[PDB]
Amino acid sequence: SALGKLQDVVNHNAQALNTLVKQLSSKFGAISSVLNDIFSRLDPPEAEVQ
């Protein structure tokens, strides 16, 4: 634990970046979280708001 500060810097950056990448698979209230499936499912009038 002597080198705690540098490892804390590395851990902070890694976990923030990993949170960013994991949040990409969030629905945000969609029917589906993949834009391709949204594109092959609905009319552009509602695909637009989706």
Binding site: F39, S40, R41, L42, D43
Partner: protein, 49 residues
Amino acid sequence: VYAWNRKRISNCVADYSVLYNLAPFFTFKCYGVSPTKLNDLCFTNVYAD
């Protein structure tokens, strides 16, 4: 209409460009999928009534 038929479609390739001469003056207004890209898709179970 009351005794409508039910047909099972499976283990075959479905083409939609053929459904022009067989059914003139058709209207494919429909739901659940964009008809523009029915060509590049796969369907697990198809029922025709």
